[PDB]
Amino acid sequence: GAMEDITSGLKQLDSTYQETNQQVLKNLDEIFSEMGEEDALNIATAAIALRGDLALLKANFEANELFFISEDVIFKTYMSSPELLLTYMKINSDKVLVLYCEGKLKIEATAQNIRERLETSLKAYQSNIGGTASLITASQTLVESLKNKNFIKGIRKLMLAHNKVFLNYLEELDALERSLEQSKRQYLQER
């Protein structure tokens, strides 16, 4: 649904990245065939950011997109309802209370894995976003600066969407814990 949107956002950003990188390497090849010197240095600096910090941004977005795939599998299956969670615990005081024990434990473990992923992603963005300044500094005209700034705004928008996705997982797990406890109460009441 909204994940086609995010996948697409990523493909667009990647395309702009490849083209920015192509343009920069072409420019370096031409340069190395005082205002011009400062510009050449700004461009080499951009080439470095593109290979380094910004490649790390790209890898981060990619790891997230893959995860959104596999974790989506998890949430559409054994994590999709209390009944199916309990069943999953069964295949892998009372004999059913313990099953709920296992289910709640699995929810907790899932939330923890999601938090660790989100933390890693937030850290990668925080550490690498600063490298985008160099694309602004290397711009030779206000038009080029505008295009680079749009690219950067796009990077931030994609990041805002990914954070929404992670937090949405956590919220779903919270609702599911509520429901699992309500179902557990209802079960005990019927036994």
Judged by beta carbon, residue 170 or residue 188, the one nearer Cl ion is: 170
Q: How far is the CB of 138 from Cl ion (least distance, A)?
A: 40
Report in angstroms how near the CB of residue 115 gets to Cl ion at its nearest: 6
Select 72 or 171, whichever has its Cβ closest to Cl ion.
Answer: 171
CA distances from 159 to 10, 62, 102 (A): 10, 11, 34
- Alpha carbons 64 and 141: distance in angstroms, whole number: 34
Q: Which is nearer to Cl ion, 3 or 170 (CB)?
A: 170
Q: How far is the CB of 118 from Cl ion (least distance, A)?
A: 9
| Cβ-contact 176, 82 below 8 angstroms | yes
Between residues 66 and 170, which has the closer beta carbon with respect to Cl ion? 170
Q: Which residue is nearest to Cl ion (CB)?
A: 170
CA distance linking residue 170 with residue 8, whole number of Å: 24
Q: Which residues bind Cl ion (CB under 5 A)?
A: 170
What is the amino acid identity at position 64?
N
The least distance separating Cl ion from the CB of residue 158, rounded to whole angstroms, comes to 22
DSSP, res 16: H
HSE-up (13 A, CA, CB side) for residue 53: 18
